[PDB]
Amino acid sequence: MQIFVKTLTGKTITLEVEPSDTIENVKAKIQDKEGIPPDQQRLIFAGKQLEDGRTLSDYNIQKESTLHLVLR
């Protein structure tokens, strides 16, 4: 499925992900798509910073949803 990651510079990308995917590999995928090291990304959804441990469905984030990226 696809979701959208939006940064605070305005940029907005759409990347392939799996509901089962954890937060780290989403970052991993963000890395692979834009070159940003997961080592420096923070994903926000509905005023909360998704913890590396939970997944997308674990958090109940249905497809097409938007996540926010805040670089360390």
Binding site: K6, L8, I44, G47, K48, V70
Partner: protein, 199 residues
């Protein structure tokens, strides 16, 4: 019922209503509880100040050792000012603490606070964040208060620029109030305030 002088609050209550300030629409007062230990005050932002246009509410409670120990006052309406907690309404004024006096009238207190709006007392702050911004950027402070006055005090025009930055963060799903305190506390830096927001 340990409230000593319920017969003074009553006199000082008349006093305020019958004052020229109230007809001049600068200050006004209202009762909240029967016994007369908690009033609700309201003052107008003084002209020529970012508070202009705003109408601010104050929580006035009277403690047991009243005359002698001053009455505890808080700002109900959210205000951004060196001498008022930007997130609790706690005030910091000499007379509302130790430099308080025997016969200080409520009217003397309401006017005092109004005057305070016209000229803060940064060196004896209550809110470190506000006092700092008010010194290292008296312009930003003013622009920031002009906003707070608008979103919370029913004042007119506000910075269309700041509304833009409050939008980008609210997008991530943050609470409005929170968003504002972060942006105001971090010098309106979308990056450095989103930071604070996560702690």
């Amino acid at each position: 019922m340990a409230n000593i002088a319920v017969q003074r609050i009553k006199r000082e209550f008349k006093e305020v209503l019958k004052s020229e300030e109230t007809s001049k629409n600068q200050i006004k007062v209202d009762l909240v509880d029967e016994n007369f230990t908690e009033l609700r005050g309201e003052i107008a932002g003084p002209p020529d100040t970012p508070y202009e246009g705003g109408r601010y509410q104050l929580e006035i409670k009277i403690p047991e050792t009243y005359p002698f120990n001053p009455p505890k006052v808080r700002f109900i309406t959210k205000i951004w000012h060196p001498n008022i907690s930007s997130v609790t309404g706690a005030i910091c004024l000499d007379i509302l603490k130790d430099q308080w006096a025997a016969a200080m009238t409520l009217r003397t207190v309401l006017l005092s606070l109004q005057a305070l709006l016209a000229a803060a007392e940064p060196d004896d702050p209550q809110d470190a964040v506000v006092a700092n911004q008010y010194k290292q950027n008296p312009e930003m402070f003013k622009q920031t208060a002009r906003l707070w006055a608008h979103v919370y005090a029913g004042a007119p025009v506000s910075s269309p620029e700041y509304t833009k930055k409050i939008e980008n963060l609210c997008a991530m799903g943050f609470d409005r109030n929170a968003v504002i305190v972060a942006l105001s506390s971090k010098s309106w830096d979308v990056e450095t305030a989103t930071e604070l927001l996560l702690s």
